[PDB]
Symmetry: D2
Subunit: 444 residues, 4 copies
């Protein structure tokens, strides 16, 4: 059961679906160059064509309208809007203005993500997010988006998963630009978080707008394999690296000193945190976005710099090898209310990848239906406790370019044949439409 | 400047600093005897062989204490007198302390007894010392014997004096005995001392069924950031964790501070020496909290330092040690402990200062020391008006004594000691302190 | 190839023997490691394996049919000492029978003492981390020298201390799966010391002139770019994999650059006693090399040891390992230049590919190609005077491939693990013919 | 001593000149460092110093009366370039006049370009941490070469880059007093790179044969015990103090064992550009050594570089430094064996002792003894063919001794800093006689 004001939704990002990579004045992003770099992405796959959504946006709007979702979440491609530094590209902005206007016409609330990892190559070449100037480049991008789209757009999300864009990209080398440097990584994270707060301030101050704005963090709760002191330190450090490094500056206006000390094996000055920065980072928002996928069971490692490694999990697992963990999702939400925030929470991404077999114009993904149903049940149980999860966005609308895995993994509720660009609904899409329908059918 | 009727004025010493008679009464060498004889470790090879010769002249020193009018006299028991070999109780050594405590009761003086004031027997050291977990049990054999023989006579017990000094200053920084430089040894040493504290409180309250007040003494130095920069805040935090929170958190919160555990992980790569049930024992409820206070430290950030901090320049008035005179920062510290840590009654188990004392025509005009003590007693009074419940103040020290690695080069006493003749001469501060006590009464 | 050149094939005890609880055998670290969750592919073990304990006579005929000069096998420690100080004469009798039979069939037995099957009783006392493991191993080695030195042709003390040490105690991939750099360097030191003591014992106590040596796996390391950063990266990968083992064995010292790099985890080297390094570096008769691939590496600021794997565009095996015969030639040249002038034996070389059985035959041309390129390299190097005296083809049988289990097939003879049927792959016929051709060249 | 042996004495500009804000001079890092609280002994500074800028003629007569062959002094950078790009001819004229007057009095001017007085303007742009410092220093060196090469007898580019680099940017004891290992290695690299560029400029552009070289302070390091730990400690102390500077200068490379140890703080070496090390290792005419003492070291698990000072039972100077003439001999033999065959000059040797002025005389028999033992060692080494071509006694005058201020007296001539009176110590008379005795020996 869900409340009458509960928002069902689905979501995508620009580089994962759009394609048309050198069309409409678009110039290359870090992910274009990363896909072309040897050994970084699965079988050299890229987002040149992707789901061809830039051309086929109208067909996909109908699919969204057919699902009956209250809200559609999408991201704006920075390299379409500012293909060069200081050079606005109005053709790029028109596409999004048309996309948002068409969604509104169809009774669909547009929820817009400003940054979903597609940094322009001109920005990267000046240091990217490692450079403090990146705060001001992003503000020019945001200003132009607010000025042209704030009358149409229903909600703004400044940043999607700064852990991925920051740590996974600059420390672990898995995402673009694929660096392995903790110093660059903490500087990148700080400038993303600061750009978040400057953008919120700009919307509410300069533009005098009451459009709901917030951030989205990916959160993965961390559990100790045993109750030994070592394994408690492992959990703590994993929690701090994945969660508290981002939650503390956003809601407390401080970085966790335990992680600062732990990172001091690589980071030997924090003078990049200027005075006034953490107050701006912690500027009050209208909601809090959460991307949730799984937990991580950890144990202690004497040979790890950050004192933790992954432990063996006996849980049921997705196609990615990630734990299916709705009980731990409930722990996470409870903790955020206890420790961090009383803001309305939106689950801005939840979903799963399974080995989907297309067989005779049909995809039987009972496993994806299970996953989503367990989490929606966990959302309903939490709302009965008073945890205030106002909405939920199913990731993803269609099968799309899944980053370093390429098209090898399929997260979509709608199947996509990538050589014909045919959309075929999966059983989970039918099920999800009917969940929204059955919900809507009983409400006033 | 006024103190409640139940307020306790006192003075204090430790065994190795004053007793002398190092090879007499069955006493075998401690870590400090061998440290003093190890080259480059102590000022001009000075040692505690003779010291104040207090072991022979205890009666004379009781008269001085009696004349001062102090409610309480704090002294330490020498472990190597009581257990000169492992498992070998020496009853002659115990007899001295029984006599000492009995005589103090006769002269109307409350005896406050420190079990461990750094004088670890050499036999313990040779088996690994405090780095070894058996050190918990060796200390418990020592403490059991002391409780059995003296609990009826002694007014209050102090398990450990300054585990930071015995642990970090001794096993990490290498300044005190046994002078090691190993962070892993150091955190094992600290842990076993703290665990031996908790086991002894448990022992006295449970085995002996005694209600005699027991607690610990920690030396606490509040830490201040030179500037408001993030770097300097990290420096303050890490200095405060290293000096203070590493000891406060296990005692009162039953946990170690994880920010310091992570910082120490540059050297310490497993915390499995912390067994399950240890931190609950370490944090066993005490009857009072003991604080040794001397100064603050102003710190700034250092990128080249493993713990991210160095000392910054201080413009404050300084003692003969070069330590800041810091009564305001003492007030910050007490307020913080009430706000974050404990509501137990606090005893300032050591406070004092070293200055360049000159004997002139049979007198020592140590007005600088008087000033120092006075500024802190004023702080104690002002803090008690706020409800901070500092129930006692012990002036360090009774006699000029052996000042550890500085030797006899530094004089902390309120009674001057000519170490050639062993003559006791009252400094101006002793007469002043005796009169402060009278005034209170 | 020269007339004295030895062709061989090789196995290890836990990988093929099976009969895990039979003949008085007690568990090893690998038995337990297989039965720990998440450590081995689909929980596979060496309980049954190739059933070679029972079927050894059949396999002796296969070896004989191959025409190999030498067969290399390992002795299972837990069969010889199933409990501490408790000698098992049944366990020894098997290996005595095996070696005598091979001698009767005209085959040289080359014997590996330690191939990773540490008894559980030794692990429960600390294992290789404990200095007493040197003495435990000597008791094991003494018994093997006493009962077999007359029968055996050559002795190999240790197989791949990098694997048994660093992969096992630092990286956690092999048994017992620990992740502690301090345990790892002690483990390695005691393995290398036990080697040195065992060589001293054979030549001193027993007065024997039987050829003895050690086997190190070696993987040459290459910098992605010519920058200073990537030179450090290569230096450190090389030190971690190769120099940490080569320097003590041949120079009687550890490389200080690695000691300094390891000092982020290791804060005392007092486990290296006086006399140990002179014992570790005791003169051997040959040097053994297990070779498989190179590694292309680059610099990483976020890595404690300053290197990570760089993208390789080389042809790869079924394992993803680079097929790297040119780099094999670089390595051998380096060893003659820097380290040793002893006769080299390639004690393991081979590859794994996706082998299918079709119509009673395995068409492993990929494996033939691999082996051919390396045998060519050996022949080229021996023309330069590099003195590679022999080559063993890993492996005789498809076997238990450690953390990969039975998912990976390295054998020249296919094994159906359900039936225990031996089927010759194309590579076995080919290799037998390579040997035949070499023999036909000899006068 | 041999017929071509050079006896000398030495000073540096900030230590003796004073006149800090006169002649167009702007502040150096040391002026600002002296005004920074807690850095220098009782806030002492080089404002007046020995007032040698005004009293240079008197001090020349003292040098003349000493009978030294050579006088080594340094040029104050802020007198020559008080602002970036602005040449100051009044400042240059002073050093031209000084050098000319020394030539007229039969004295060889040996000139040090950099003796730690970096102009403040250079500091405010990052200083030695900035790669531009190489070019700033080259503009300064060019101007000195253009105006003084005819007059000057020998050039020293840099004095003690260990102090100006590691003691200044890592340990925080000298100006600008930073504690950052990353800044420290960049500083050292740029100093060494500026050395090599300056040597190239003198021999290439100016086409000059004037002898040029670097001066390194060298402290040989010794293990307390024979244990492995203590060998690592000695190795690391030697690398930090000596090999880090010797290897680039003579081998064109940095020692990788130290790069690995410094990687706890230094996470990229891209500041070392291609070509730099070949420029740094450009061939010089002589090698300069500042020698003072040894250091006995032992292992420390709590230390990042694995070493701490060990107790020494040697006779000590007033600084607490070991009097170590035997160890000096070890150093010189090591340099010939491992590094260079250039003629060596001891560009600084000397000692501080608690000098008391008594009845217009200073009885510094302790300083006499020290210098005698080292001059004996020099003579003994030259009998072995070690080719020490000269000795400069540090110092001519009691002077501003850096972070110790005027609390420590290294001079052979006493200076009453309250009155600026020069008074010859017994060592000065003695030293003059030693030179006299040596001259009387030559035909």
């Amino acid at each position: 059961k869900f409340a009458p004001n509960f928002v069902f939704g689905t979501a995508t990002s620009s580089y994962q679906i759009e394609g048309a990579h050198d069309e409409g004045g678009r110039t290359p992003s870090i992910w274009d160059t990363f896909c072309d770099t040897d050994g970084k992405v699965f079988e050299k796959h890229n987002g040149d064509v992707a789901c061809d959504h830039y051309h086929r946006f109208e067909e996909d709007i109908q699919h969204i309208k057919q699902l009956g979702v209250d809200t559609y979440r999408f991201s704006i491609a920075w390299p379409r809007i500012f293909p060069s530094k200081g050079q606005f590209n109005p053709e790029g902005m028109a596409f999004y203005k048309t996309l948002a206007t068409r969604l509104q016409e169809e009774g669909i609330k547009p929820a817009v993500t400003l940054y979903h990892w597609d940094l322009p190559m001109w920005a990267h070449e000046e240091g990217g997010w490692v450079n403090r100037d990146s705060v001001d480049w992003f503000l020019d991008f945001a200003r132009v988006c607010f000025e042209e789209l704030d009358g149409i757009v229903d909600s703004w999300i400044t940043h999607n998963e700064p852990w991925c864009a920051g740590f996974l990209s600059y420390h672990l080398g898995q995402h673009a630009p694929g660096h392995t440097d903790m110093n660059e990584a903490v500087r990148a994270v700080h400038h993303m978080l600061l750009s978040h707060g400057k953008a919120v301030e700009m919307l509410k101050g300069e533009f005098n707008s009451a459009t709901p704005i917030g951030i989205t963090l990916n959160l993965a709760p961390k559990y100790a394999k045993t109750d030994s002191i070592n394994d408690q330190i492992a959990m703590n450090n994993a929690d701090g690296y994945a969660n508290r490094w981002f939650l503390d500056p956003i809601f407390k206006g401080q970085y966790p000193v335990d992680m600062m000390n732990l990172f001091s094996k690589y980071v030997h000055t924090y003078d990049f945190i200027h005075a006034g920065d953490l107050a701006t980072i912690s500027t009050p928002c209208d909601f809090f976005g959460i991307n949730f996928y799984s937990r991580n069971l950890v144990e202690f490692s004497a040979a790890s710099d950050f004192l933790h490694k992954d432990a063996y999990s006996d849980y049921d697992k997705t196609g990615m090898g990630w734990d299916i963990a709705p009980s731990e999702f409930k722990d996470l939400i409870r903790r955020l209310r206890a420790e961090y925030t009383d803001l309305p929470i939106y689950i801005t991404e939840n979903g799963a990848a399974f080995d989907d077999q297309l067989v005779d114009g049909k995809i039987h993904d009972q496993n994806r239906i299970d996953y989503v149903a367990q989490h929606l049940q966990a959302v309903s149980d939490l709302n009965d406790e008073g945890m205030n999860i106002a909405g939920y966005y199913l990731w993803s609308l269609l099968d799309n370019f899944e980053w370093s895995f390429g098209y090898d993994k399929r997260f979509g509720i709608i199947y996509v044949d990538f050589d014909t660009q045919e959309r075929i609904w999966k059983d989970s899409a039918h099920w999800y439409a009917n969940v929204i329908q059955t919900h809507k059918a009983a409400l006033p």
